[PDB]
Design a protein around this ligand. Structure first.
Ligand SMILES: [Mg+2]
Ligand code: NA
Ligand SMILES: [Zn+2]
Ligand SMILES: [Zn+2]
Ligand SMILES: [Zn+2]
Ligand SMILES: [Zn+2]
Lengths: 162, 162
DNA sequence: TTGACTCTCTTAAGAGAGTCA
DNA sequence: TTGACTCTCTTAAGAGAGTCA
């Protein structure tokens, strides 16, 4: 809600509830042929999810609290960042999964950045493969690699140059 | 159905028309601190665009030809690939700008790949910076770099471990 | 046959808000 | 007050199809 105290109380209640989600260990590529281990705190697959939580889409949730007799609601991954600017360079700030695991709500696996920065981590080589993200990746992005391009650049005639 | 010869004729008329678009020289980052040059064949900002071309969105165009009294229409960047498979790994193939310049229709600046592969090139370090795309990038992606993350992973209590 | 407009849709990273019990 | 559902929207890489003269 409005006060900094009220916001801190929201963050603390969320952390306490998410802290009781099942902890699932995931072994992950780091880049450079190395592997690491992440501990994701995963929201349940079906109701009940935890105090204050409800599912608004297949992999979307919201956190809800009643403050001063008014309901306040947030996207379930945005709560750690309620004291942060909600935009950057005129772009909306988004909760970004460093673990690439939507159900995970571990705040040690989240950052707060533009949707472009968020998306781009899907192709990052990872913290041991050349990640240059200033807020470093926790793993190689799941889509990193050579790709599966069907056809490359080509012309039939002689009208074009690179 | 259009024959192979008729499809080749469509590609040839498309190349003839696009080859007469304004050719703009752009200096671009290649990665590794190196600079290169790309020559983009840019569709005009407003009508007329060229024979067969029309705008269906702010940065979307279509190519149209009428063959044996039947109107055929294609996305304006898809024409170089009409003789190629149109899906791979269960994913639709998309025209992918190696030059990251939407108005460009140079077929030497296009490839044909899944939408995920297409998007991922935005963050590639480039052909002189570590690109691993099997069909190699022509330049460093416009979004490559450290990013502008507003807040990193953090917790207030001690409920979580990474 | 052609040009210049019109409209909505796909994807996968993300959101906000209303209806009931 | 709290829970469990419902719906549509945003972005930036991409699409198909209709109307009129
Ligand atoms: Mg692209
Ligand atoms: Na993400
Ligand atoms: Zn996680
Ligand atoms: Zn990274
Ligand atoms: Zn180009
Ligand atoms: Zn590349």
């Amino acid at each position: 809600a409005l006060t900094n105290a009220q916001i801190l109380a929201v963050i603390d209640s969320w952390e306490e509830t998410v802290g009781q989600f099942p902890v699932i260990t995931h072994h992950v590529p780091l880049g450079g042929g190395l592997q690491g281990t992440l501990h994701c705190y995963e929201i349940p697959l079906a109701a009940p999810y935890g105090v204050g939580f409800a599912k608004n889409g297949p992999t979307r949730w919201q956190y809800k609290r009643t403050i001063n007799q008014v309901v306040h609601r947030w996207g379930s991954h945005t709560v750690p960042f309620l004291l942060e600017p909600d935009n950057i360079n005129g772009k909306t700030c988004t909760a970004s999964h460093l673990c690439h695991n939507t159900r995970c709500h571990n705040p040690l696996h989240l950052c707060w950045e533009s949707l472009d920065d968020n998306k781009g981590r899907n192709w990052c080589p990872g913290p041991n493969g050349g990640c240059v993200h200033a807020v470093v990746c926790l793993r190689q992005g799941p889509l990193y690699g050579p790709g599966a391009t069907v056809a490359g650049p080509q012309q039939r005639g002689s009208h074009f140059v690179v």
